[PDB]
Structure 1
Amino acid sequence: ARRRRAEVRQLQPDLVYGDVLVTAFINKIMRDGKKNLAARIFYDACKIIQEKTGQEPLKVFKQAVENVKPRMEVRSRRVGGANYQVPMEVSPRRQQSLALRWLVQAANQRPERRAAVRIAHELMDAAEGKGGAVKKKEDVERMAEANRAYAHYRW
């Protein structure tokens, strides 16, 4: 807001892997404060990453997140009559946030019926450079670039 930069909330680390990044993601899976369900959904899903590969879920998790972060996004800026979608950098923080949200949002578009499978497969696909999360992210750099002409308003 207007006065100051606003403090970013330090999340409490994860109770299993001890990663702050896992509770973020869990907090995105969470709906109506039903956090038990959420973390219960994320851990089942980590076990699905075992059954379908001898890889640690954390490693693969961290790899999905890295492939869904965007580099640049169109951010809407206004002239005063007509409006230009302008391309520009993405913050570290914003990247993480975008990445986890898409991941979740993407995972729940999926056609399998349990959430834990949906989140696992979508994690698997995204670390393999191509889920629906990755399209979103791609779409977003293909929205910049499609508009690289207007990169001289970089606000």
Structure 2
Amino acid sequence: ARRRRAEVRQLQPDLVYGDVLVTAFINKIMRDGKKNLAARIFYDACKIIQEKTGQEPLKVFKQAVENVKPRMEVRSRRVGGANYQVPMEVSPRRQQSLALRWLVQAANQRPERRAAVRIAHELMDAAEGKGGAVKKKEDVERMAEANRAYAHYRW
């Protein structure tokens, strides 16, 4: 991005819920190219909440995920002494993706054999403020602020 600020890729509206950001999630499980399996993988961890519960995973991903979405983070920074950590108001598109870059990561970490489970079972704990991901997100929302000791370099 040294010449042009670049431009964001946009996608199709899930052949299901009718949303695309989820296309991403469904693709954040996508691994190796086989979104085929991953297609369902997500989908099922839904009808396994319509099999394991009776509330369509709409506010789950929603109200939950957006929580796993870091309201603020820390970064490096060099001057005359070193690369001092800096607290700064996170981005949207960043905060955003990190929702999933964290779901699918600490979500496949949870030991529940089949992809599906870990999936459903994660959105779960997520849509409750508990379990895997939310730590990191917080872990850092917490990291930042905890490092509020740095602001001389504001940004």
Calculate percent identity across the aligned residue pairs: 100
Confirm or deny that 1:106 pairs with 2:96.
no
1:38-79 Cα offsets, whole Å, 9 max, x none, are 111001111112122211112212122111000110011112
Comparing 144-153 with 131-140, greater Cα deviation is found at 144-153
Partner residue, 1:46 = 46
1:70-118 Cα offsets, whole Å, 9 max, x none, are 0110011112442211010111111111011101101111111001000
Point out where structure 1 has 5 or more consecutive residues left out of the alignment.
none
Give TM-score scaled by structure 1 length: 0.95
C-alpha distance in 1 between matches for 2:103 and 2:140: 14
Give TM-score scaled by structure 2 length: 0.95
C-alpha distance in 1 between matches for 2:80 and 2:128: 43
C-alpha distance in 1 between matches for 2:27 and 2:151: 34
C-alpha distance in 2 between matches for 1:134 and 1:22: 18
CA RMSD of aligned residues (A): 1.2
**Structure 1 runs, 4 residues or longer, greater than 6 Å off:** none
C-alpha distance in 1 between matches for 2:93 and 2:59: 20
Partner residue, 1:29 = 29
* Greater helix fraction, Structure 1 or Structure 2: 1
Aligned residues: 155
Point out where structure 2 has 5 or more consecutive residues left out of the alignment.
none
C-alpha distance in 1 between matches for 2:72 and 2:45: 30
User: 2:67–2:129: 8 Å Cα contact kept in structure 1?
Assistant: yes
1:98-141 Cα offsets, whole Å, 9 max, x none, are 01110110111111100100011111001101111100111111
Confirm or deny that 1:129 pairs with 2:129.
yes
Q: SS at 2:45's partner residue?
A: helix
C-alpha distance in 2 between matches for 1:40 and 1:80: 52
Q: SS at 1:87's partner residue?
A: strand
User: 2:60–2:126: 8 Å Cα contact kept in structure 1?
Assistant: no
* Greater strand fraction, Structure 1 or Structure 2: 1
